[PDB]
Design a protein around this ligand. Structure first.
Ligand SMILES: [Zn+2]
Ligand SMILES: [Zn+2]
Ligand SMILES: [Zn+2]
Lengths: 119, 65, 97, 49, 99, 92, 56, 56, 56, 149, 237
């Protein structure tokens, strides 16, 4: 989902069907504005979340003394200098998979062996 | 308060041996162990009597009346 | 034995010092413009934002260490949360390290 | 000395072992009930009621 | 206590001061005893302890259009207390314990 | 001189602390069986050092001899009897 | 003395037995027990070894 | 005497209070009938109310 | 604070490696004291609760 | 267990499966409301195969796509058809239901309404799907354990 | 100074898996809960997209935004600053029709009783609405299972009122009663002599009884503040 608002209003856009042409539009309910939809996906629930997993990976993440270190070679620059956390999406069921951030290239890599990620 | 007359456990007179125990430490510069020994405080019951004593009297004397 | 209690300081020399070291007032905040922006908090008041907290910290941290900011004043930087909490506050139990 | 109780050397107690002092302070005042009507610290005796 | 007497106390006076009559600088005297058979004299801790009096000092504020406000009990060994400055020999003299 | 700093629980959250200085400072390139089993100084991120671990204790517990050799509530009990005790409370 | 060596060793081997389970659960391999989180199950095994150890 | 009638219902409510508050002072959401001192006044209910009351 | 973040080790979550003879480390001291306290609370609560139970 | 079943773990495994309360919510990864106006064509290229088959051997232009988890389905030993027929029997002749097979790389269920202000109607049906629908097992009977007493 | 603890809640109505998950807030002297959005309009932030921007600082964070779609609709019925202050005004009570009453009542609440730290000065809406948004953001983070629900027992979030703050509490209550004593002598002036005792004795009472409350009528007032120094051992002291 993307969040678009009506110009000359900055008020939120509500969906409306152009039944005559079979196509989705977004009407402003504060004014007379309308725009064609970008994507047919309007609503999304996502019960099993994977967004929040690597929360707050600020470039200053390395400056955190509290954070632990590893000598694992990075998949990008093969630097033996990393920092790691696990959960960040603080849910009860969550796994203990470690998220490593390179103190050099700053690319995120998991310790996951079952799954095969990219971020 | 003030150096007890005689060791509690065995009754050996430790009351006289105070002033000399202070001299052995200050003047003679001996250690607390050899001082008690030179004074003739053989068994540890008497040793504790002098070694662990606090002569508070000196602090009470300081108050005017 | 080592514990003490924060007696109460004045936050005004810290609010003054902050704006003269990179603090953008909250009235001029544009969230889409400064998204990584580190939120500055003095005695639980969001006073504004700062773009390079690392350099602001090094300065505040040593200012207090020199004795310029009172040593009972608390300064925390939760990097993950993009926040900088300061306390001139009275009540806090402190210990020496 | 059974069940968290103990035996003490009396010959030691005699010599002044674990011996302590004790003090208690009792206090009083000559309360003034109204005007010129005052209480008086004295050795009283059988005088009326 | 030292942060309260030095600062906080002046602050309480200046916040609800002025009326329809304003308040200025507050002065905190040393501990005294305003008793009859005499007028006033300095009260030392040991005395107060024995004579069951309050070891408190006078509070004076300058009223605009000086004035006695009341008596603030002083904490022993605090800024405004007598012992604060006193030496070991001073305390032994003052019948007060150095410890 | 900035050799020593004051830290509250809120600030403690953003620091790492070394227990002993020495025992928690160089690195590895025999041991006494009688001594206790201590951990390590593998952290190179150390921001502060504890003056002495025994300063976690208050007045009452500070009088207990070898309290690291007693079952914890037993220590909490002697923390209350130290009050039902006797001696000189002052010299005056 | 030799019994203290044996004890030190029993705690040491139980310490490594925990690490093996800690790194196992960090690579998502560790299959969760029925009606239990991967964490609930990881901890159960950890608290078990650390008690087995103390008991032995 | 000279009954203002909407003042009779004021002194009536006062007698109704005192007689109620003599028997029970620890009344459900109402002001405790305080004694001069600021003390609440022991009701008769309060006297027999267990753990230390007549009964218990 | 003496530990790094996301540390699940025996040493970090409260395992006491030492005997009462060898004596506890500062980490071991506090963790034992934490668990020890829970005991005195529970005890103090358990007496109150059983108090009522016996009487009813 | 029943008299002549005590030793058999498989008999037990069956009853455990027959009483353990499973909801639609437990197997669902995401609930999506798409705008697919042609019942015969799909804006989603994945679902292009699924339509062909559940159209061989009038509808709303609003799609409600549910993605179910393979592992979740496997711990609670479920089939896409099982799940399907359950959604099918909940709304009866008011919701047109299509679904991918247990082989298809992505597990999906497509739902279109039957026969102004319709998009808001699907948000209601999506909660009645997760929160209301009971898949298998007796209600309240949440975690069922196997014990060799 | 002042000493008036007014508490503000930002409630997320509707549980896990319940349609219409609306965010409403508890404003002082306002009998009912008000939707977040109305408060934003009453604060000046009128377009629902600028209101959004004060809560979610990222536009990529769709998850937090879908969560605010209901809130927008809840408030959609009010569209300007005046409508929002009147709505809040009507929820406060007093049947005061309209402008100089209803609206001016709400204005006062948002300046004096709403987020009373920050500032209580007139023009500071940009500050109080940005702060309201910080709370909504923190609320959602937890409802989206990202931030762990705040620990009530973290010692760093606790303070210990010592010998000073405790006397500060009395002295302020005592001097403000003395100010009221003075104001009664000036009123009586149909046309010096101020009760010194009130302050002297007030402090004496409290430090004796251990009842941190004026002055014989100390119930409900904190009992056990001032106890007599334990003097058995030098350690026990
Ligand atoms: Zn518009
Ligand atoms: Zn790298
Ligand atoms: Zn002897």
């Amino acid at each position: 989902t993307t969040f678009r608002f009506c110009r000359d209003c900055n008020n939120m856009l509500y969906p409306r069907e152009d039944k005559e042409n079979n196509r989705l539009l977004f009407e402003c309910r504060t004014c007379s504005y309308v725009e064609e939809a970008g994507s047919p996906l309007v609503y999304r629930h996502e019960l099993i979340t994977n967004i929040g997993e690597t929360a707050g990976v600020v470039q200053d993440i390395g400056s955190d003394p509290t954070l632990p270190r590893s000598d694992r070679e990075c998949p990008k620059c093969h630097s033996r200098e990393n920092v790691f956390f696990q959960s960040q999406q603080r849910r009860k069921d969550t796994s203990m998979v470690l998220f490593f951030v390179c103190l050099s290239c700053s690319h995120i890599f998991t310790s996951d062996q079952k799954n095969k990620r990219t971020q | 308060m003030i150096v007890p007359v005689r060791c509690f456990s065995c009754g050996k007179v430790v009351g006289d041996k105070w002033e000399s125990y202070l001299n052995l430490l200050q003047e003679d510069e001996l250690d607390e162990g050899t001082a008690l020994s030179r004074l003739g405080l053989k068994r540890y019951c008497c040793r504790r009597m002098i070694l662990t004593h606090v002569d508070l009297i000196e602090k009470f004397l300081r108050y005017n009346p | 034995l080592m514990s003490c209690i924060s007696v109460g300081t004045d936050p005004m020399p810290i609010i003054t010092f902050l704006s003269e070291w990179g603090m953008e007032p909250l009235e001029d905040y544009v969230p889409h413009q400064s998204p990584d922006a580190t939120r500055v908090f003095v005695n639980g008041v969001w006073h504004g934002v700062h773009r390079n907290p690392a350099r602001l910290m090094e300065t505040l941290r040593t200012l207090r260490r020199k004795g310029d900011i009172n040593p009972e004043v608390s300064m925390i930087r939760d990097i993950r949360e993009k926040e900088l909490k300061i306390f001139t506050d009275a009540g806090r139990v402190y210990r020496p390290l | 000395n059974q069940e968290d109780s103990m035996i003490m050397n009396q010959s030691s107690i005699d010599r002044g072992l674990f011996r302590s002092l004790f003090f208690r302070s009792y206090m009083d005042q000559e309360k003034k009930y109204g005007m010129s009507i005052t209480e008086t610290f004295e050795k009283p005796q059988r005088t009326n009621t | 206590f030292n942060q309260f007497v030095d600062y906080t106390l002046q602050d309480i006076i200046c916040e609800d001061s002025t009326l329809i009559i304003s308040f200025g600088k507050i002065y905190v005297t040393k501990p005294m005893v305003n008793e009859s058979d005499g007028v006033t004299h300095a009260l030392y801790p040991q005395e107060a302890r024995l004579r069951n009096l309050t070891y408190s000092s006078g509070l004076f504020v300058d009223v605009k259009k000086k004035v006695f406000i009341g008596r603030l009990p002083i904490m022993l060994r605090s800024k405004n207390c007598y012992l604060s400055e006193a030496t070991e020999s001073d305390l032994y003299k003052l019948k007060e314990c150095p410890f | 001189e900035g050799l020593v700093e004051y830290i509250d629980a809120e600030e403690e959250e953003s620091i790492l602390i070394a227990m002993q200085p020495e025992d928690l400072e160089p690195a590895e390139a025999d041991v006494d069986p009688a001594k206790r089993i201590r951990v390590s100084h593998h952290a190179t991120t150390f921001t502060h050092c504890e003056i002495h671990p025994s300063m976690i204790l208050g007045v009452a517990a500070s009088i207990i001899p070898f309290p690291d050799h007693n079952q914890s509530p037993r220590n909490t009990y002697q923390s209350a009897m130290g009050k039902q005790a006797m001696g000189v409370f002052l010299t005056n | 003395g030799p019994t203290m060596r044996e004890i030190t060793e029993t705690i040491a081997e139980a310490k490594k037995k925990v690490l093996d389970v800690t790194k196992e659960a960090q690579a998502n391999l560790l299959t969760a027990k029925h009606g239990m989180t991967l964490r609930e199950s990881f901890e159960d095994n950890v608290v078990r070894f650390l008690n087995e150890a103390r008991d032995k | 005497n000279g009954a203002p009638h909407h003042a009779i219902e004021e002194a009536e409510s006062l007698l109704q209070f005192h007689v109620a508050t003599y028997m029970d002072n620890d009344i459900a959401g109402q002001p405790q009938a305080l004694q001069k001192s600021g003390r609440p006044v022991k009701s008769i209910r309060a006297r027999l109310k267990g753990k230390e009351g007549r009964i218990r | 604070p003496h530990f790094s973040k996301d540390d699940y080790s025996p040493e970090s979550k409260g395992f006491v490696e030492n005997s009462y003879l060898r004596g506890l480390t500062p980490q071991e001291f506090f963790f034992h004291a934490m668990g020890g306290r829970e005991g005195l609370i529970d005890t103090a609560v358990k007496t109150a609760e059983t108090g009522y139970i016996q009487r009813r | 267990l029943e008299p002549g079943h005590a030793a058999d773990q498989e008999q037990a495994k069956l009853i455990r499966s027959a009483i353990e309360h499973t909801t639609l919510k437990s197997v669902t990864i995401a609930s999506e409301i798409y705008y697919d106006p042609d019942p015969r064509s799909t804006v989603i290229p994945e679902d292009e195969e699924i339509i062909q088959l559940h159209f061989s051997l009038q509808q709303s232009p609003w799609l409600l796509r549910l993605e179910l988890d393979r592992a979740a389905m496997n711990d609670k030993d479920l089939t896409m058809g099982q799940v399907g027929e359950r959604i099918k029997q909940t709304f009866k002749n008011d919701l047109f239901v299509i679904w991918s097979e247990d082989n298809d790389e992505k597990l999906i269920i497509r739902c279109r309404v039957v026969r102004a202000e319709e998009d808001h109607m699907l948000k209601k049906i999506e909660n009645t799907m997760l929160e209301n629908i009971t898949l298998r097992g007796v209600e309240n009977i949440e975690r069922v354990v196997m014990m060799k007493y | 100074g002042s000493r008036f603890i007014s508490t503000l809640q930002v409630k997320l109505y509707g549980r896990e898996g319940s349609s219409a998950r609306t965010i409403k807030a508890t404003l002082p002297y306002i009998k009912q809960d008000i939707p977040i959005v109305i408060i934003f309009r009453a604060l000046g932030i009128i377009p629902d997209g600028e209101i959004l921007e004060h809560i979610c600082y990222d536009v990529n964070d769709w998850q937090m935004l879908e969560m605010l779609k209901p809130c927008v609709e809840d408030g959609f019925v009010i569209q300007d600053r005046e409508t929002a202050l009147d709505f809040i005004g009507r929820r406060g009570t007093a049947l005061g029709i309209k402008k100089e009453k209803r609206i001016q009542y709400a204005k006062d609440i948002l300046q004096k009783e709403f987020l009373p730290h920050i500032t209580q000065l007139e023009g500071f809406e940009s500050r109080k609405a940005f702060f309201l948004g910080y709370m909504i953001n923190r609320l959602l983070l937890c409802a989206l299972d990202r931030k762990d629900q705040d620990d009530r027992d973290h010692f760093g979030k606790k303070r210990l009122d010592l010998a000073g703050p405790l006397l500060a509490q009395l002295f302020k209550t005592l001097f403000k009663k003395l100010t009221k004593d003075i104001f009664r002598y000036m009123q009586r002036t149909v046309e010096l002599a101020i009760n010194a005792k009130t302050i002297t004795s007030g402090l004496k009472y409290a430090l004796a009884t251990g009842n941190w409350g004026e002055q014989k009528k100390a119930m409900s007032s904190r009992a056990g503040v001032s106890q007599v120094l334990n003097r058995y051992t030098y350690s026990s002291t």
